Design a protein around this ligand. Structure first.
Ligand SMILES: N#Cc1cn([C@@H]2O[C@H](CSCC[C@H](N)C(=O)O)[C@@H](O)[C@H]2O)c2ncnc(N)c12
Ligand SMILES: [Zn+2]
Length: 261
């Protein structure tokens, strides 16, 4: 089974997630009561312990807890589709909005979008929609096109191209890509969080990937710390599901920091 708050792979587990795992296994298997701090570590460290270490920490259930973890590793749980759907929209909005602010593309070519929906409606950019099979109710504002690099590598050179879960043979250089040799023109997109929303004072967040105005001095406000952690869960939930993010090579996070001056 699964408790719906341990659905990600154990490598993504936090210290509190491990405590929930011990408490969940205490009732699911009628194990003897065990203190939460018996395994005071994150999931990334719990995977480095030996089975002998489990017995030393928990003489009554250490061997049972170890074998339970192995089956979790051998058979990863499936994430909820709606939560994965929400995670994909949140990451898509974050990445595209940041890219448009960083490099100020005059036009966006959304390739693979059959519903003519902008993920960044306030972007102030010419939004173009392309799809091989446009929806009937949106085809009037969608160009019917099947993208192939051998056919269109000389097209859509202006602005940026968006291939969000649009698996094509090879992406052009000016691309923003999510996918579940084709990325030779691109680079991997590292994790980051960007927010231009106002700060509000009502655990201190230490991270160089929190691109917020309050983090210029290292003091992330409560509002952006909570939004950062909610986004990180969505990012991890999407990476755990087998999605990878790729971007044009000149993408630079320092362009996002310059938006605060
Ligand atoms: N292979 C391939 C191709 C598949 N698509 C379209 O991309 C979509 C993938 S599902 C929706 C993805 C959307 N960007 C979203 O963010 O939800 C479908 O509508 C499919 O018809 C294509 N379109 C243009 N040229 C192609 N070469 C393909
Ligand atoms: Zn802030």
């Amino acid at each position: 089974r699964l408790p719906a708050h341990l659905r990600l792979q154990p490598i993504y587990w936090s210290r509190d997630d491990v405590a929930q795992w011990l408490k969940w296994a205490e009732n699911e298997f009628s194990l003897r009561p065990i203190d939460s701090n018996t395994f005071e570590m994150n999931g990334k460290a719990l995977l480095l312990l030996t089975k002998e270490d489990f017995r030393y920490r928990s003489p009554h259930s250490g061997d049972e807890l170890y074998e339970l973890l192995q089956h979790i590793l051998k058979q990863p749980a499936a994430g909820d589709e709606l939560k994965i759907n929400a995670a994909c929209r949140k990451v898509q909005h974050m990445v595209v909005k940041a890219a448009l602010l960083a490099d100020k593309f005059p036009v966006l070519h959304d390739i693979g979008n059959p519903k003519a929906i902008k993920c960044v409606p306030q972007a102030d950019v010419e939004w173009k929609f392309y799809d091989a099979q446009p929806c009937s109710d949106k085809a009037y504002k969608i160009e019917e096109l099947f993208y192939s690099y051998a056919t269109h590598s000389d097209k859509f050179t202006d602005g940026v191209c968006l291939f969000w879960n649009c698996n094509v043979d090879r992406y052009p250089a000016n691309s923003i890509v999510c996918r579940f040799s084709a990325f030779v023109n691109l680079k991997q997109l590292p994790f980051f969080y960007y927010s231009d929303s106002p700060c509000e004072s009502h655990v201190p967040l230490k991270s160089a990937t929190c691109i917020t105005r309050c983090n210029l001095g290292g003091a992330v406000c409560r509002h952006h710390a909570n939004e950062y952690r909610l986004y990180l869960d969505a990012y991890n939930m999407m990476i755990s599901a087998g999605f990878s993010l790729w971007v044009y090579k000149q993408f630079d996070t320092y362009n996002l920091w310059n938006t605060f001056t």
